[PDB]
Each structure stands twice: as C-alpha cells, then as structure tokens.
Motif scaffolding. Sequence first.
Motif, mmCIF file in Angstrom:
data_model
loop_
_atom_site.group_PDB
_atom_site.id
_atom_site.type_symbol
_atom_site.label_atom_id
_atom_site.label_comp_id
_atom_site.label_asym_id
_atom_site.label_seq_id
_atom_site.Cartn_x
_atom_site.Cartn_y
_atom_site.Cartn_z
ATOM 1 N N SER A 41 -69.124 -45.344 -49.166
ATOM 2 C CA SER A 41 -69.260 -45.856 -50.523
ATOM 3 C C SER A 41 -68.274 -45.227 -51.495
ATOM 4 O O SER A 41 -67.894 -45.877 -52.475
ATOM 5 C CB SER A 41 -70.690 -45.641 -51.023
ATOM 6 O OG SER A 41 -71.241 -44.445 -50.503
ATOM 7 N N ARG A 42 -67.849 -43.986 -51.257
ATOM 8 C CA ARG A 42 -66.909 -43.350 -52.170
ATOM 9 C C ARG A 42 -65.467 -43.749 -51.892
ATOM 10 O O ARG A 42 -64.596 -43.496 -52.731
ATOM 11 C CB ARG A 42 -67.049 -41.829 -52.106
ATOM 12 C CG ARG A 42 -67.355 -41.287 -50.724
ATOM 13 C CD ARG A 42 -67.979 -39.896 -50.786
ATOM 14 N NE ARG A 42 -69.368 -39.907 -51.236
ATOM 15 C CZ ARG A 42 -70.367 -40.528 -50.621
ATOM 16 N NH1 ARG A 42 -70.188 -41.171 -49.479
ATOM 17 N NH2 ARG A 42 -71.582 -40.487 -51.158
ATOM 18 N N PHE A 47 -61.719 -44.419 -58.432
ATOM 19 C CA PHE A 47 -61.175 -43.066 -58.452
ATOM 20 C C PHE A 47 -60.497 -42.723 -57.131
ATOM 21 O O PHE A 47 -59.459 -42.054 -57.116
ATOM 22 C CB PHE A 47 -62.276 -42.056 -58.767
ATOM 23 C CG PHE A 47 -61.891 -40.632 -58.489
ATOM 24 C CD1 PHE A 47 -61.156 -39.910 -59.414
ATOM 25 C CD2 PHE A 47 -62.263 -40.012 -57.307
ATOM 26 C CE1 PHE A 47 -60.799 -38.601 -59.165
ATOM 27 C CE2 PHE A 47 -61.908 -38.703 -57.054
ATOM 28 C CZ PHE A 47 -61.176 -37.997 -57.984
ATOM 29 N N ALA A 48 -61.075 -43.162 -56.012
ATOM 30 C CA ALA A 48 -60.450 -42.914 -54.717
ATOM 31 C C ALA A 48 -59.088 -43.581 -54.620
ATOM 32 O O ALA A 48 -58.224 -43.121 -53.866
ATOM 33 C CB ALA A 48 -61.362 -43.396 -53.590
ATOM 34 N N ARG A 84 -52.672 -47.009 -63.038
ATOM 35 C CA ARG A 84 -52.748 -45.980 -64.070
ATOM 36 C C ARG A 84 -52.281 -44.632 -63.538
ATOM 37 O O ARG A 84 -51.676 -43.842 -64.273
ATOM 38 C CB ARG A 84 -54.175 -45.882 -64.609
ATOM 39 C CG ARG A 84 -54.690 -47.170 -65.225
ATOM 40 C CD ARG A 84 -56.074 -46.992 -65.827
ATOM 41 N NE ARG A 84 -56.837 -45.944 -65.159
ATOM 42 C CZ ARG A 84 -57.578 -45.042 -65.786
ATOM 43 N NH1 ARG A 84 -57.684 -45.029 -67.104
ATOM 44 N NH2 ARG A 84 -58.234 -44.132 -65.072
ATOM 45 N N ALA A 85 -52.558 -44.347 -62.263
ATOM 46 C CA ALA A 85 -52.143 -43.076 -61.680
ATOM 47 C C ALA A 85 -50.626 -42.943 -61.659
ATOM 48 O O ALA A 85 -50.085 -41.877 -61.976
ATOM 49 C CB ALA A 85 -52.711 -42.936 -60.270
ATOM 50 N N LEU A 86 -49.923 -44.012 -61.284
ATOM 51 C CA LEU A 86 -48.465 -43.956 -61.226
ATOM 52 C C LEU A 86 -47.863 -43.766 -62.612
ATOM 53 O O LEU A 86 -46.874 -43.041 -62.770
ATOM 54 C CB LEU A 86 -47.919 -45.224 -60.570
ATOM 55 C CG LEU A 86 -48.129 -45.322 -59.059
ATOM 56 C CD1 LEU A 86 -47.552 -46.618 -58.516
ATOM 57 C CD2 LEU A 86 -47.517 -44.125 -58.355
ATOM 58 N N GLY A 87 -48.441 -44.408 -63.627
ATOM 59 C CA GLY A 87 -47.930 -44.244 -64.978
ATOM 60 C C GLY A 87 -48.076 -42.824 -65.489
ATOM 61 O O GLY A 87 -47.194 -42.308 -66.180
ATOM 62 N N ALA A 88 -49.189 -42.172 -65.155
ATOM 63 C CA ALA A 88 -49.438 -40.805 -65.590
ATOM 64 C C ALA A 88 -48.752 -39.767 -64.714
ATOM 65 O O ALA A 88 -48.807 -38.576 -65.036
ATOM 66 C CB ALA A 88 -50.943 -40.530 -65.625
ATOM 67 N N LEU A 89 -48.109 -40.184 -63.628
ATOM 68 C CA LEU A 89 -47.413 -39.273 -62.732
ATOM 69 C C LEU A 89 -45.941 -39.115 -63.094
ATOM 70 O O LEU A 89 -45.242 -38.313 -62.470
ATOM 71 C CB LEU A 89 -47.563 -39.763 -61.285
ATOM 72 C CG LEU A 89 -47.226 -38.845 -60.108
ATOM 73 C CD1 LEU A 89 -48.274 -38.997 -59.022
ATOM 74 C CD2 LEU A 89 -45.853 -39.165 -59.549
ATOM 75 N N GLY A 90 -45.469 -39.826 -64.113
ATOM 76 C CA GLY A 90 -44.078 -39.772 -64.507
ATOM 77 C C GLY A 90 -43.228 -40.926 -64.030
ATOM 78 O O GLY A 90 -42.011 -40.909 -64.253
ATOM 79 N N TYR A 91 -43.822 -41.925 -63.388
ATOM 80 C CA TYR A 91 -43.081 -43.098 -62.954
ATOM 81 C C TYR A 91 -42.775 -43.992 -64.146
ATOM 82 O O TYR A 91 -43.600 -44.148 -65.051
ATOM 83 C CB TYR A 91 -43.884 -43.882 -61.919
ATOM 84 C CG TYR A 91 -43.657 -43.444 -60.496
ATOM 85 C CD1 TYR A 91 -42.530 -43.843 -59.797
ATOM 86 C CD2 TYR A 91 -44.577 -42.633 -59.848
ATOM 87 C CE1 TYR A 91 -42.325 -43.447 -58.497
ATOM 88 C CE2 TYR A 91 -44.379 -42.231 -58.546
ATOM 89 C CZ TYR A 91 -43.251 -42.640 -57.874
ATOM 90 O OH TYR A 91 -43.055 -42.238 -56.574
#
Length: 115
Positions: A41-42, A47-48, A84-91
């Motif tokens: 389930s996770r 988030f995963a 959203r993760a890629l945008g906040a990673l500097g991409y």
Amino acid sequence: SVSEGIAHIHASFNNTIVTITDRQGNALAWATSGGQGFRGSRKSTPFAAQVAAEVAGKAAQEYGVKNIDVLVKGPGPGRESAVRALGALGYKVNSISDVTPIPHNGCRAPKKRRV
RNA sequence: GAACUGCAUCUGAUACUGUUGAGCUAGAGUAUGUGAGAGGAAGGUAGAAUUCCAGGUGUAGCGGUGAAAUGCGUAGAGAUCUG
C-alpha cells in the motif's frame, strides 16, 4: 555528457517507474517506488513517487543533464508528485507532456472485477 | 286453448348484408423533383492501441493484491528508442 534529456514518469495504480533518458531514448538512470523500501500500500502513494524521482533524478544529475522535459503516462497517483520532485531538485524543465496510450476502441479489455 | 323459437312453399318490402351494371375519390397504390440516415451486401484502406519477433540504452526489479503469493527477471526483465 548530455545536457538535454527526457524524464519518463510511467505511473500505474500499483507502482510508478521514473526513468530519465537523453533526447534520443537511451536510458541513463531509473528508480521505482517498489525499489525504495515501499511495498504494497505504501508503494502506490504519491510520496513513494516523490522519492523515486528524487533518487533517479539525482542519480543522473552527475551525467550533466540540466534541461529535461517530462513525459507522464498512466493513471497513477505519482504522476503529479514525481514532477514536483524534479523541480525541487534543481532541474530546469523544458516541457510537461502527457503521452498516455489511448486505444481507439481496439483490443478488448479484461472483464470487470466482482469485488 | 296457448305454445312447440322450427321447416317448407308462395306473396309483398328494399333500410342493411349478399350478387351484379355504371360512375366517384376520400382509403390503397403509380410517375416526376428534392432530403436524411450505424438500412443491407461485396471489396479496399487509415490511425491509435495491445501482443509477438529483432536490435540500441540501462540495472534490480517488474507484475499483482485489501494484503500477498503463483508468474516474469541477472540466460538482463520492467522502463525507453528504432524497425
């Protein structure tokens, strides 16, 4: 080595696969929700997918990619969280696109589940 | 006495049914002009998508479920690109 690349955000209801490649289609790195300690389930959570894109994006950040355009596909919940993760990673995103396979009434689907 | 609803044969009537002659268009059809339609039959072709086969990139998972497991995968899967 390569600066322009493509992010594939293939996301299903169970799992999300985030592989990022070059402009040509040669994979550089890939990460999955189920390959990050999340199971069951996770694994099917937004988030995963956030950590899967974070791991895969950082893995090939050493390659030299800074410009990348995502290609989201699938109905999964990590289709929005992963980007959203890629945008906040500097991409530096080039374009957000959704190439999902939509048949024009082709092959027959599996039967409806009786749950 | 009444009744026995009946049957037969003559006579009369002609509103209706039957049989006939003539006529009519209002029911039903015909010719002519336009129109819509996944109506039917025979061929051809287009684009997505699935599956399979062959290659390139790539590495440890994929798939599935309420959870799992069977299954697929280090003989290289899944993902991605080209046929």
